[PDB]
Amino acid sequence: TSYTYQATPMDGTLKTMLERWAADSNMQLSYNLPSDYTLIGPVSAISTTSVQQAATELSAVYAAQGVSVSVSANKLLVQPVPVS
C-alpha cells in the first residue's frame, strides 16, 4: 504494498515533498516558515503508511531547526514549534 509516506526521487525539498504528501492525501499544506529547506539524509528513513507517524518522524528531523510538522485536520502544518 500500500501507499507509503516517504521521500522519493521526485522530492528535493521539505515543502515540495509535503506538497506531494498533501496532494496524495486530499490534504492542505500550511507551510508557515520563511524558507524552504532541502531534505536532509535522515528523511530517507521515513517509510510508513501512517501519516501521523510520517509527519511526526519528519517533525523530529527538523526539530533542531526549530520546526514542528503535524497533522491538523485536513492539513499538514509546518510551523515554528509552539511552546508554553
Numbering used by the authors: 51 to 134
The publication says:
In well-characterized T4SSs, VirB7 is a lipoprotein attached to the periplasmic side of the outer membrane. In order to understand the unique structural features of Xanthomonad VirB7, we have solved the solution nuclear magnetic resonance (NMR) and X-ray crystal structures of XAC2622, which we now call VirB7XAC2622, and studied its interaction with VirB9. VirB7XAC2622 presents all of the characteristics of VirB7: predicted signal peptide and lipobox sequences followed by a short and extended region that contains the VirB9 binding site. However, unlike other VirB7 proteins, VirB7XAC2622 has an extra domain whose topology is strikingly similar to that of N0 domains found in proteins from different multi-subunit complexes involved in transport across the bacterial outer membrane.
To better characterize the globular domain, we cloned and purified a recombinant fragment encompassing residues 51–134 (VirB7XAC2622_51–134) which was submitted to crystallization trials that resulted in large plates which belong to space group C2221 and diffracted up to 1.0 Å. Molecular replacement was performed using the solution structure of the VirB7XAC2622 globular domain as the search model. There was clear electron density for all residues, with the exception of the first amino acid (threonine 51) and residues 122 and 123 in the loop between β4 and β5. As expected, the crystal structure is very similar to the NMR ensemble, displaying an average root mean square deviation (RMSD) for the backbone heavy atoms and all heavy atoms of 1.05±0.05 Å and 1.61±0.06 Å for residues 53–130, and excellent agreement with the backbone 1H-15N RDCs [Q factor of 0.187 (regular secondary structures only) and 0.272 (all residues)]. The globular domain is composed of two α-helices sandwiched between a mixed three stranded β-sheet on one side and an antiparallel two-stranded β-sheet plus a short 310 helix on the other. The VirB7XAC2622 globular domain has no significant sequence similarity to proteins of known structure. In addition to the canonical VirB7-like N-terminal region, VirB7XAC2622 has a C-terminal region that includes a globular domain (residues 52–133). This globular domain does not interact with VirB9XAC2620_154–255 but does interact with an extended region (residues 42–49) that immediately precedes the globular domain in another VirB7XAC2622 molecule, leading to the formation of homo-oligomers. As expected, no cross-links were observed when the experiment was performed using VirB7XAC2622_51–134 which lacks the disordered N-terminal region.
